[PDB]
Write a protein that binds this ligand. Structure first.
Ligand SMILES: [Cl-]
Ligand SMILES: [Cl-]
Ligand SMILES: [Xe]
Ligand SMILES: [Xe]
Length: 162
């Protein structure tokens, strides 16, 4: 198990534009295209991201490519963020993966605001962090995925994804 597999689980794979949990235009492996209500707009955004006139459909590889770039940007965003980096560097490998998933899902800024959990995670206070992570809108909107991620963060194992 690794970050790629983990996120492929949580996000799924879709070759046609779809709408996410929040009602947004997304494609592939959770590649958000836009917050706008316009399908054309999403289309514009898709064609620019892919380099061709997609008509709203992409191939598997194309999807994998965007995914690769999304994961890469997620790590990098972590590493460039003053509040995130220290926590991450302090964690073991499985737990890092949890932080990456979340960042990928809610953006850096958003995760960067979980002050309190960030601190608890940095102190290796697993259970507390976990309880704290659960007091969030994140958790109330997508609890099944949130539960998987939190378990991972808490235990440092992949049990939630096996
Ligand atoms: Cl892009
Ligand atoms: Cl759910
Ligand atoms: Xe996390
Ligand atoms: Xe966090």
């Amino acid at each position: 198990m690794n970050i790629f597999e983990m996120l492929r689980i949580d996000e799924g794979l879709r070759l046609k534009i779809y709408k996410d949990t929040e009602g947004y235009y997304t494609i592939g492996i959770g590649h958000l295209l836009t917050k706008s209500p316009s399908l054309n707009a999403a289309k514009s955004e898709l064609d620019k991201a892919i380099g061709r006139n997609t008509n709203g459909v992409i191939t598997k590889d194309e999807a994998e490519k965007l995914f690769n770039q999304d994961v890469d940007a997620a790590v990098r965003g972590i590493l460039r963020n003053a509040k995130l980096k220290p926590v991450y560097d302090s964690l073991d490998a499985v737990r890092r993966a949890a932080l990456i998933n979340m960042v990928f899902q809610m953006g850096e800024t958003g995760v960067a605001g979980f002050t309190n959990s960030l601190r608890m995670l940095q102190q290796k206070r697993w259970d507390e962090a976990a309880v704290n992570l659960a007091k969030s809108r994140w958790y109330n909107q997508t609890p099944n995925r949130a539960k998987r991620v939190i378990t991972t963060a808490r235990t440092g194992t992949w049990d939630a994804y096996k």
